[PDB]
Symmetry: D2
Subunit: 221 residues, 4 copies
């Protein structure tokens, strides 16, 4: 169903602490290698008054390299696709709720995304854009009530040292009856390679791999 090279087109509508914005984007990736890149740009609400890193992870776990021994919940959902919902709980009390509907049209994944962040205080690193980058992460994926769940705790590196902690709790809902996997991990590394002054344009890359944890195939042969 899925070629080695596919395209991405998306649109995100949302608000942060009550001020609306919208962002559209187009990009490419390869699902069997867990790598993807995209070009995003603010089309409403610009220039955005919050740190851009708050959106990076909301911008499709199909771009995760899955080994044969682990069941792929994502590539198994197509051509029908899947949707996901997520609430990102920040350390300072800022909460971001997100939704993404993923569909397939030939070689392009289409995302309908909604984003709502609240209770970010004026002095925090989000309202004042003091974030640098998300550090690499490790997601825990488990089955609960027939649905695939994703748990991550991670942080954002700040200018001048330190980390800003966030708790991810994702629910993955495939649109068709699919084979569920066992408890496993997905490692993540998200990166904005290039952007402009006000982040009206962003170059975003993400590499992701799935694994079982501490077990290797390295038998020197």
């Amino acid at each position: 169903v899925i070629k080695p090279d596919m395209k991405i087109k998306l649109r995100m509508e949302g608000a942060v602490n009550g001020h609306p914005f919208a962002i559209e984007g187009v990009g490419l990736g390869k699902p069997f290698e867990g790598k993807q890149s995209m070009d995003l740009k603010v089309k409403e609400g610009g220039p955005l008054p919050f740190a851009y890193d708050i959106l990076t992870t909301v911008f499709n776990r199909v771009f995760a390299k899955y080994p044969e021994n682990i069941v792929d919940y994502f590539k198994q959902s197509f051509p029908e696709g899947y949707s996901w919902e997520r609430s990102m709980n920040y350390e300072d009390g800022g909460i971001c709720n997100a939704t993404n509907d993923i569909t397939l049209d030939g070689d392009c994944y289409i995302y309908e995304i909604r984003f709502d962040g609240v209770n970010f205080p004026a002095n925090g690193p989000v309202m004042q854009k003091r974030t640098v980058k998300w550090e690499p992460s490790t997601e825990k994926l488990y089955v609960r009530d027939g649905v695939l769940k994703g748990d991550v705790n991670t942080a954002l590196s700040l200018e001048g040292g330190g980390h800003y902690r966030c708790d991810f709790k994702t629910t993955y809902k495939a649109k068709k009856v699919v084979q569920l996997p066992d408890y496993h991990f997905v490692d993540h590394h998200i990166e904005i390679k290039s952007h402009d002054k006000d982040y009206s344009n962003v170059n975003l890359h993400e590499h992701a791999e799935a694994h079982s944890g501490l077990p290797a195939m390295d038998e020197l042969y």
Copy 2:
């Protein structure tokens, strides 16, 4: 600026588990008695596939009886108004973020409300309409970083008995420099007096009073 009798008008757009809906409403209340009434009507996404009670609390702190000794942050905020944000943390992980921008036009308040709930599981009492009502609450209101915040932990009663807990953390942002108050409380009681089968029409009542905690002079 504020009559003892005022009117309410508002429209809410939002989504629950990714399924959009919209609701508009109009009503009246008494700001100095902490009581208000509303009639709410669904306009999109109906019939709603989730328990209605999660929107009741999103549907104004000006309807709170404030004693002279406690500074009222809300009535001070008018005629220019205030906005507020809130996260509602449900005990099983469903989280609802809500937004409300308030203005006043003559004698009526207009609310621009946004509501977004996620990670509500299929088997829970929100997706399966297993809630009965909100219990009365007591909100803790405090100042942090120049704005008034409101914290309340409360619960929802279920059919077969029991309670479903939710944590509210509200940020009130007044648009006009205002006098901040001391640590205080607001007692709450929300009720839906009448609704229809699919909850496509709802009558909502709320009574609220402010106090300073444990303090009759027969005179």
Copy 3:
């Protein structure tokens, strides 16, 4: 069962951020007025290098004024008694777990308390003793899993102004089966009325009345 005037005797053992201490205390109160006072003294590990207010709340719903319309779970559990467990999660990451075993010996309540706090940062207001007092609170009490639970989220006022909030999760387990109440609330006001510089002696008061909220 409970006379209008009784006294309290207690001992608390515990540690905060890994450093042990012990405290005993004696005091009295009136259960039908929800008021009680006690005199506590540090007996081990003193002087305590953490804010004293984090232990205050841990040293007995028996001192709560209950109206006829609300079931009193505590005075009804006596003379057999009850135990309780609680976790206190502070906004900055410090967690305090405590237990209190309540017994009655004639006219006195005897407390066997355990208290354990961890993950308090050096610069926070507990390690730098930056608390003034607990603000008055309102506890929400409900039955869950056949047992009565009490939830409170309150805060501690700080010196330079501001509040440090805490999440309370209490479990009340009567030692003998007692008739359960419905959802209701209890308002609390606790205060250290007199103490010495190192808090080796503390006079602590608590006033409490029970209600069913706004009609």
Copy 4:
């Protein structure tokens, strides 16, 4: 001058939901391979009425293979040692507070451990011991105000399928000023390899290596 093979001696005192217990243990491991095993016997409060898996993780991140590019905080803290504090919050409300004071005596690590768990409900999988094993994990270690921190959120596989989640919040405090490392991870795998009916005897294994995540 700390060898590839070391010995472990350990004692734990604590309580769960108010009922006291004690456990002693002896074991061995290789800190440069991230492998260790130990034998643990109950000494007080036995037979334990709660799931044993909640204590396994309290039973020393010196047993982690650290690559050269990552700073070892733990092997640098010896021979003076270090201490750690931790909270463990389970999704159903049971919370466990623990402390470990680590010591070195020749070639043996000595643990002084305190453990306190509260609010574990009767029907939950801990009081009815329906836990099977901890799933493998990955801990996030970062510095926050001059101290090394460890964050890991996991679950416990339940018997009959499903997972019971826990959030770990550890504070690592070396008793000697040491070089702090940058953001990095430690992968874990713990197994109760042998045990008794009521768990009066347990042989416990842990494998651990540190890494910097995906490139």
